[PDB]
Design a protein around this motif. Structure first.
Motif, PDB file in Angstrom:
ATOM      1  N   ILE A 154     -35.683 -30.885  -6.670  1.00 47.85           N
ATOM      2  CA  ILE A 154     -34.834 -29.638  -7.057  1.00 47.85           C
ATOM      3  C   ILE A 154     -36.161 -28.660  -7.481  1.00 47.85           C
ATOM      4  O   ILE A 154     -37.210 -29.383  -7.787  1.00 47.85           O
ATOM      5  CB  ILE A 154     -34.182 -29.909  -8.359  1.00 47.85           C
ATOM      6  N   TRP A 155     -35.889 -27.474  -7.371  1.00 51.23           N
ATOM      7  CA  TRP A 155     -36.689 -26.548  -8.369  1.00 51.23           C
ATOM      8  C   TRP A 155     -35.581 -25.899  -9.024  1.00 51.23           C
ATOM      9  O   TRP A 155     -35.626 -25.572 -10.606  1.00 51.23           O
ATOM     10  CB  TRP A 155     -37.817 -25.591  -7.831  1.00 51.23           C
ATOM     11  N   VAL A 193     -38.653 -33.560 -15.674  1.00 50.39           N
ATOM     12  CA  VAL A 193     -39.008 -32.453 -15.293  1.00 50.39           C
ATOM     13  C   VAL A 193     -40.535 -32.029 -15.712  1.00 50.39           C
ATOM     14  O   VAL A 193     -41.118 -32.268 -16.467  1.00 50.39           O
ATOM     15  CB  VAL A 193     -38.339 -31.391 -16.083  1.00 50.39           C
ATOM     16  N   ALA A 206     -31.993 -34.428 -19.154  1.00 52.32           N
ATOM     17  CA  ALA A 206     -33.171 -34.575 -18.541  1.00 52.32           C
ATOM     18  C   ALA A 206     -34.120 -35.604 -19.471  1.00 52.32           C
ATOM     19  O   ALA A 206     -34.324 -35.389 -20.504  1.00 52.32           O
ATOM     20  CB  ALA A 206     -33.955 -33.302 -18.623  1.00 52.32           C
ATOM     21  N   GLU A 265     -34.164 -38.544 -10.068  1.00 46.42           N
ATOM     22  CA  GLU A 265     -34.151 -36.911  -9.817  1.00 46.42           C
ATOM     23  C   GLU A 265     -35.389 -36.430 -10.498  1.00 46.42           C
ATOM     24  O   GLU A 265     -35.959 -37.278 -11.280  1.00 46.42           O
ATOM     25  CB  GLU A 265     -32.844 -36.082 -10.457  1.00 46.42           C
ATOM     26  N   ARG A 324     -34.135 -38.672 -14.957  1.00 46.73           N
ATOM     27  CA  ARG A 324     -34.559 -37.374 -14.398  1.00 46.73           C
ATOM     28  C   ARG A 324     -35.880 -36.913 -15.141  1.00 46.73           C
ATOM     29  O   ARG A 324     -36.287 -37.413 -16.382  1.00 46.73           O
ATOM     30  CB  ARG A 324     -33.501 -36.350 -14.683  1.00 46.73           C
ATOM     31  N   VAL A 331     -36.914 -32.609 -11.256  1.00 47.00           N
ATOM     32  CA  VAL A 331     -37.007 -31.072 -11.252  1.00 47.00           C
ATOM     33  C   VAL A 331     -38.311 -30.660 -11.214  1.00 47.00           C
ATOM     34  O   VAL A 331     -39.278 -31.397 -12.024  1.00 47.00           O
ATOM     35  CB  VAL A 331     -36.349 -30.465 -12.495  1.00 47.00           C
ATOM     36  N   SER A 348     -32.439 -25.807 -24.793  1.00 46.02           N
ATOM     37  CA  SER A 348     -31.371 -26.080 -23.671  1.00 46.02           C
ATOM     38  C   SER A 348     -30.579 -27.176 -24.103  1.00 46.02           C
ATOM     39  O   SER A 348     -29.945 -27.960 -23.332  1.00 46.02           O
ATOM     40  CB  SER A 348     -32.335 -26.490 -22.383  1.00 46.02           C
ATOM     41  N   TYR A 381     -34.970 -24.005 -17.141  1.00 46.81           N
ATOM     42  CA  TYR A 381     -35.092 -25.197 -18.507  1.00 46.81           C
ATOM     43  C   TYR A 381     -33.551 -25.903 -18.462  1.00 46.81           C
ATOM     44  O   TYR A 381     -33.647 -26.839 -18.916  1.00 46.81           O
ATOM     45  CB  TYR A 381     -35.696 -24.490 -19.618  1.00 46.81           C
ATOM     46  N   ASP A 382     -32.632 -24.941 -18.039  1.00 48.64           N
ATOM     47  CA  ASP A 382     -31.361 -25.841 -18.037  1.00 48.64           C
ATOM     48  C   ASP A 382     -31.481 -27.072 -17.358  1.00 48.64           C
ATOM     49  O   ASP A 382     -30.154 -27.573 -17.642  1.00 48.64           O
ATOM     50  CB  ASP A 382     -30.259 -24.547 -17.861  1.00 48.64           C
ATOM     51  N   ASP A 383     -32.463 -27.464 -16.742  1.00 46.92           N
ATOM     52  CA  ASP A 383     -32.344 -28.812 -16.244  1.00 46.92           C
ATOM     53  C   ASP A 383     -32.833 -29.703 -17.291  1.00 46.92           C
ATOM     54  O   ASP A 383     -32.467 -30.775 -16.960  1.00 46.92           O
ATOM     55  CB  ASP A 383     -33.222 -28.782 -14.988  1.00 46.92           C
ATOM     56  N   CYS A 384     -33.475 -29.465 -18.557  1.00 45.02           N
ATOM     57  CA  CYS A 384     -33.811 -30.206 -19.622  1.00 45.02           C
ATOM     58  C   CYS A 384     -32.678 -30.246 -20.524  1.00 45.02           C
ATOM     59  O   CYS A 384     -32.616 -29.712 -21.733  1.00 45.02           O
ATOM     60  CB  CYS A 384     -35.047 -29.517 -20.364  1.00 45.02           C
TER      61      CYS A 384
END
Ligand SMILES: NC(=O)c1ccc[n+]([C@@H]2O[C@H](COP(=O)([O-])OP(=O)(O)OC[C@H]3O[C@@H](n4cnc5c(N)ncnc54)[C@H](O)[C@@H]3O)[C@@H](O)[C@H]2O)c1
Ligand SMILES: NC(=O)c1ccc[n+]([C@@H]2O[C@H](COP(=O)([O-])OP(=O)(O)OC[C@H]3O[C@@H](n4cnc5c(N)ncnc54)[C@H](O)[C@@H]3O)[C@@H](O)[C@H]2O)c1
Ligand SMILES: NC(=O)c1ccc[n+]([C@@H]2O[C@H](COP(=O)([O-])OP(=O)(O)OC[C@H]3O[C@@H](n4cnc5c(N)ncnc54)[C@H](O)[C@@H]3O)[C@@H](O)[C@H]2O)c1
Ligand SMILES: NC(=O)c1ccc[n+]([C@@H]2O[C@H](COP(=O)([O-])OP(=O)(O)OC[C@H]3O[C@@H](n4cnc5c(N)ncnc54)[C@H](O)[C@@H]3O)[C@@H](O)[C@H]2O)c1
Ligand SMILES: O=P(O)(O)OC[C@H]1O[C@](O)(COP(=O)(O)O)[C@@H](O)[C@@H]1O
Ligand SMILES: O=P(O)(O)OC[C@H]1O[C@](O)(COP(=O)(O)O)[C@@H](O)[C@@H]1O
Lengths: 301, 301, 301, 301
Positions: C64-65, C10, C73, C33, C8, C35, C103, C67-70
Motif C-alpha cells: 500500500i502507500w 510501516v 500496525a 501487509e 503489518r 505500508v 495515530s 500515519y493513520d496506517d500505524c
C-alpha cells in the motif's frame, strides 16, 4: 538433451524413517528428483503415489520408484533394516551397497540404520569408497534433542544453544559440557555444570521413551537427515555432528564415530577435534572402544 | 505481556493424516503454535516429542500436546475418526465440536475425516458457526490427483493445468471437463474430450489403489490440508475446490459439497458457479442428491 | 469481518535502505501487509507500483502507500533521514514518532537511521514507549560483516562462526574476541588472538569502502533488518546483537547501545552480559561514554 | 575434487535491474554461485561487498565479482545497456556475447535489456546458439501487471487470474482477451470484454507512470526475471510468457516475440499457439511486423 536432473536422491528403505524423510525433502523443496527403492516394492508404489498426488501443493520435485537409478544419482540414503542384529543388517547391507555399487554409482552414502556407526563402517568397507564420501547419521538427532531441552530450559531458541553430543549414537555417547555455550556465554550460567545432568539423561533416554508411547522415532531423524542432505547438496561447508571415520584424531584409529565434521557437496571436508576435557577423553575413549569391538566381534555377515 | 501466539492450530486426531499434516506444517514454516490432541493421549505425547527433537532443523514452530487450547486458537483441524460409519463418526464428532465449542472457541474448522462433506455438514450443525467458517477438505486432493495425471500427460507442470473435480469427494464426484484448461488452451488439444476418461477414472479409483499397496492415503491429504491452511492463515483470497455449503447455487439448497470457493483468513469468502455443462449439471445434481440423502437418512448419532 | 491483517509493517523512508528492506521482506515471505510512507510521496507511489507488479512471482504480501496506517500496525521501521546531523535527524525524527504516536500506535519501533544508537534513544524519549519495545538496528550488520570475514577465513560458513561486535555501531565499537568461537572451538585455533586484528579492521572500515565504490550500503542492512523483523514477528526468542537500553548492565546506565538481546514478538526480552574481558570492559566503557555524551550534548532538536 | 558449483549465474550489468535481480535470487535461495560483471567494475565490487555482508541472514549462496566465469556457468543474464538505441545496445551487446562465447560458454542466455525482443534476437545471431537456449524477458512483467490489476479488480489473487499479454513487450503488444480466465470462468463475468480495456491501458502505460514518479522500473522485472531463473534451474516445465523465436507459429517466421513457451532446465521446450481470435491475429501480426522491421532496418552495430 533429454530431461536432466542434477540433484538426485535414492532412499533404500521406504519405511517410517525413509518415507518421513522423503516427505521432509519434498515439503522442504530440497532435492530435484527423488527415487525410492524398497525390498517391499508394493510399499514404494503406494508411497510414491501418495507423494505424487500432493506434489502440486509443494514447490517442485520428482518422485519415481532398481538400483539402476544409482548412476548419476547424487546421493543414496540407506533407511533399510532388520550382534544378531549387527549380523542381520550387515547381512542386509552387504547386498544393498554391492547392488548400488554394481550400477556404477559415483556419489555419497547417507546411512541412518541402527546400529549406525557400525553400519556406517560396513557401508564403507563394502563401498570401496573413500571415507569422506560415506557419512553416518551419527549423533545428529542427539545434539538436536540436547540443543532443544537446553534451549527449552534457558528459554532462548535451540538455534542459539551451542552444545554437541559426540561418541556412540547410543548408550556410550557423551555430552561435551566443557565446550557448550549459549551464543558465547559458557555454562557458567549455572555451576556444577561441567538439573542439567538431567537434561542429558533425557537427551539419552529419549528413544526408549518415544518408542514406548508411539512405537518408534521417525520424524526426528528425517529432520536431521534432511539437514545433512541440505548441507551436502548446497555445499554448505557446515559443521554437523556426524558419524565420521576417525583418522587418529581424538587419538582413535579405525572406528567410525559421532564427531563434528564439515559437510559440503563432496562428502566430508575435515573432522574437528573439539578440545575435549579430562573426563571426556576417557568417555570418548570408552565409547570408541565399545564400537571398535563390535567391529572385530561381528562382521562376517 | 506473556508469550503470545497469533497463529495457532489444533489437530484433533494425530493418526496418519493428523501427524503427516503436522509434519507438513512444520517442515513448511506455516503455523506458529501447533497443539495436538488425540483420544489416544500417549500417541500425542510421542508424536509431539518426535516433532520437538527435529524442530531446530526446520524454521521455528511450537508443538505442545485438552480442548482448553481452543480459545484464541485460530483454527481446529479434525483428523479424528472411526451409515454405521456416518453414525459412528457423527457420534465421535458430536463430542469433538461440543468439547471445543465449550472452550469458547471463536475460529474456523477444517474437517478432513470421511465421509467429509457429511462430517463437514455435521460439524456446522454441531458448531453453531456460520457456514463460511466451517470448511471441508472436499474434492481438493481429487483435483490435485487430476491436475497431476493430466500435467503428467501433457508434460507441463500440474501448476499450469486448470481443471476441477467438483461434487462428492467420493464415488459421485465429476470432472468439470467443459471448463478445463492448460494455461488458457482448452482441451481442444484432443477431441472427444468433454485416454482421458481414463485419466479421470484413476483420479477416481486412486484411494483404493494406494490403500491396497500401502494401507492408506495420508501424505496427499496433508499436502492439500496444508494448502487451505496456508490460504486461511495468509488471507490468500485463493480459489480452492473445497467442501462448501450450497446456498441455492448450482441450484442446490442444504448440502455441503465440493465446489470452488474463495478462501482467506476469515473462512470462505464466496462460492463460484463454474458454468457447468449439460451433462455436468445432471452429474452434479445426482451427486448432491446422494449426499442430501445420507444427510436425512443418518444424523441422530 | 472486513479484510484483516495481523502482520503489518510501516517503513517511514522508502529510500535505498527502506526499499531494499521491503524487497527483502516480500522476496522472503515475511510480513503480510507492508505500508510504505515517505516525505517524498511520489517515490512511495513508484516503489509501491513496482513492488505490486512483481508480487505474483513471490509468495503473497500486500503493499500500500499517512500515519493513520500505524494503528494495529504491528511494527514501524524508521528508514528516514538527513552533531548538525544528530540535530537534523533528531529534528526529522521528532516529527516522525509524534506523528505515528498520534495515530494511537501500540507496537514496536525498528530504528535503522544513523546515528542509530542515538536516534534509537531519541525515538524512545519521543515515543513514551517502554525501552523493550524500541529497538535499534545497532551492531547487527557489524557482527555479520565479522562473521562473514571470519567464516570466509576458516572456510566454514558464517553460520558456524560465533563472534559478536558490541558497542557503538560506528568507530567506537569493539569485537568481543575473548568469547568468539567456531561452533565450540575458541580462537585457540590461532594465537595472539584475544591477520585477525585485520579481519576486525575491515569489519570496521567496511562502510567507507563500500560507499566509495558504490555510494552507499543498503543491501546489508536490509538483510539484518529483515532478520530482527523475522525474530519479532515469529516470537523467535533469538539472540541478536541489537541496540538496547543499558539497564546498569555492563555497569552503564542511560545509553542505548549495541548488545546481545533476546528478541521475540513483544520487543526485547532481556539483555545479556557476555563475560567481557579486561580490555573489553574498557573499550565498552569508552564507547558507551562516547554516546552518553552526544546524548547530553545534542538533543534539543 | 575442488569446491564445486552446479548452479551458477552471471549477470552482465549490475545496475538497478541487475542488482535487484541478484538481491532477488539470494533473498529467495535460488542460485548457488552468483558471479556479477559490469563495465563499471567498481560498482560490482561495491554490490558484491554489500551482498556478502547480509548473506548470513539469508539461506546460502555465493557472490563473487571477467567472462572467464562463463564456462560451466549454467546461465548468463544480460542486464547491460545504453534506432540509435537499437544500434547502441546492439553495439554494446555485440561485445558481451562474443566475450562470453569466447570463454567456451555452453549454457543459456537471459536477455532483459530494452528493446528486449530485438536484443534477444541479436543475442542469438551473435551467440551461434540454438534459439531454444536464448530466452527473452519478453512480455513477462506485462502479464504480471495484467494479472495483478485484474486480480485486484476481482478481489481474488493474481495467481488465480489466467490472462496473457503477447506480442512486442512495448507499444505493439496485445492482451489475449479471448482466452483469459479466473480459474476456469471465462470473462463472461462481464460483457463487452473480448472498465477493462482500462485495466489493459494501465498494464500498458505502466512503465511510463512508474518511471515518472521514481525514475525507473527495476523491482518488477527482477521478480519476473527470477521466475524464469527458477523455471530454468529447476526443470519446472512451466508455461511462462517469454520472448521466443517464432518458428512459423502464429504464422510468423524470423522474429523473436512475446509468446507462451515451456521453460525448463534446457532452454525452451516448445512454443504454444493459444487459439488467438480474429482481431488478435491482426494485432499479433502488426506487432510481429513492427519488430521484423527494426530487425532489417537496424543491425549493423
Ligand atoms: N540414526 C538414528 O537416529 C535412527 C533414528 C531412527 C530410526 N533409525 C533406524 O532406521 C532403520 C529402519 O528404520 P524404520 O523405523 O523406518 O524401519 P521400518 O520397520 O519401517 O523398515 C524400513 C523399511 O526397510 C525396507 N527394507 C528392509 N530390508 C530391505 C532390503 N534388504 N532392501 C530394501 N528395502 C529393505 C522394508 O521393506 C521397510 O519398508 C532402523 O535401524 C532404525 O533404528 C535410526
Ligand atoms: N478427505 C480426504 O481426502 C481424506 C484423505 C485421507 C484420509 N481421510 C480421513 O482421515 C480420517 C482419519 O484418518 P487416518 O487414516 O489418519 O486415521 P487413523 O486410523 O490413523 O486414526 C486417526 C486418529 O484419530 C484419533 N481419534 C479417534 N477418535 C478420537 C476422538 N474421539 N477424539 C480424539 N482423537 C480421536 C485416534 O486415536 C487416531 O490416532 C478418516 O475418516 C479418513 O478417511 C480423509
Ligand atoms: N544501521 C545501519 O547499519 C545503517 C546501514 C545503512 C544505512 N543506514 C541509514 O539509513 C538512513 C537513510 O538511509 P538511505 O541510504 O536509504 O537514505 P536515502 O538517501 O535514500 O533517504 C531515505 C529516504 O528518507 C525519506 N525521508 C527523509 N526524511 C523524511 C521524513 N521527514 N519523513 C518521511 N520520509 C522521509 C526520503 O524522502 C528518502 O526517500 C541513514 O541515516 C543511513 O546511515 C543505517
Ligand atoms: N524487459 C523489461 O521488462 C525491462 C524492465 C526494466 C528495465 N529493463 C532494461 O534493463 C536495461 C538496463 O536496466 P537498468 O535500469 O538497471 O540500467 P542501468 O542504468 O542501471 O545500467 C545497468 C548497468 O549496465 C552496466 N553496463 C552497461 N554497459 C556495459 C557493458 N558494455 N558491459 C558491462 N556492463 C555494462 C552499467 O555499468 C550499469 O551498471 C535497459 O535496457 C532497461 O530498459 C528491461
Ligand atoms: O497457468 P498460469 O496462468 O501460468 O498460472 C499458474 C498458477 O495457477 C495455479 O496452478 C492455480 O491454478 P488454478 O487456477 O487451478 O487454481 C497455481 O498453482 C500457479 O502458480
Ligand atoms: O554452530 P552451531 O551450533 O552448529 O549452530 C548454527 C546456528 O547458529 C547461528 O549461527 C546463530 O549464531 P549465534 O550464536 O552467533 O547467534 C545460526 O545462524 C545457525 O543456524
Amino acid at each position: 538433451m533429454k530431461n536432466n536432473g542434477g540433484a538426485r536422491v535414492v532412499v533404500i528403505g521406504a519405511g517410517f524413517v525413509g518415507a518421513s524423510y522423503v516427505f521432509a525433502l519434498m515439503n522442504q523443496g530440497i532435492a530435484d528428483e527423488i527415487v525410492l527403492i524398497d525390498a517391499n516394492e508394493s510399499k514404494a508404489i503406494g508411497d510414491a503415489m501418495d507423494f505424487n498426488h500432493g506434489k502440486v501443493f509443494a514447490p517442485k520435485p520428482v518422485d519415481i520408484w532398481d538400483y539402476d537409478d544409482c548412476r548419476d544419482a547424487d546421493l543414496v540414503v540407506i533407511c533399510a533394516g532388520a550382534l544378531d542384529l549387527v549380523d542381520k543388517n550387515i547381512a542386509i547391507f552387504r547386498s544393498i551397497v554391492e547392488s548400488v555399487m554394481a550400477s556404477g554409482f559415483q556419489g555419497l552414502f547417507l546411512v541412518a540404520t541402527n546400529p549406525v556407526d557400525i553400519l556406517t563402517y560396513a557401508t564403507w568397507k563394502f563401498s570401496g569408497l573413500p571415507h569422506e564420501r560415506v557419512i553416518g547419521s551419527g549423533t545428529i538427532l542427539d545434539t538436536a534433542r540436547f540443543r532443544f531441552l537446553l534451549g527449552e530450559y534457558f528459554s532462548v531458541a535451540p538455534q542459539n544453544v551451542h552444545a554437541y553430543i559426540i561418541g556412540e549414537h547410543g548408550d556410550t555417547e557423551l555430552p561435551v559440557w566443557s565446550q557448550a555455550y549459549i551464543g558465547v556465554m559458557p555454562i557458567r550460567k549455572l555451576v556444577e555444570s561441567k538439573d542439567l545432568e538431567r537434561i542429558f539423561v533425557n537427551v539419552r533416554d529419549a528413544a526408549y521413551q518415544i518408542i514406548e508411547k508411539k512405537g518408534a522415532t521417525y520424524y526426528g531423524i528425517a529432520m536431521g537427515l534432511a539437514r545433512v542432505t541440505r548441507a551436502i547438496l548446497h555445499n554448505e561447508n557446515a559443521i554437523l555432528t556426524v558419524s565420521a571415520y576417525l583418522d587418529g584424531l581424538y587419538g582413535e584409529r579405525d572406528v567410525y564415530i559421532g564427531v563434528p565434521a564439515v559437510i559440503n557437496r563432496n562428502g566430508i571436508r575435515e573432522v574437528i577435534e573439539i578440545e575435549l576435557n579430562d573426563d571426556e577423553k576417557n568417555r570418548f575413549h570408552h565409547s570408541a572402544a565399545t564400537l571398535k569391538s563390535v567391529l572385530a566381534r561381528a562382521f562376517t555377515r
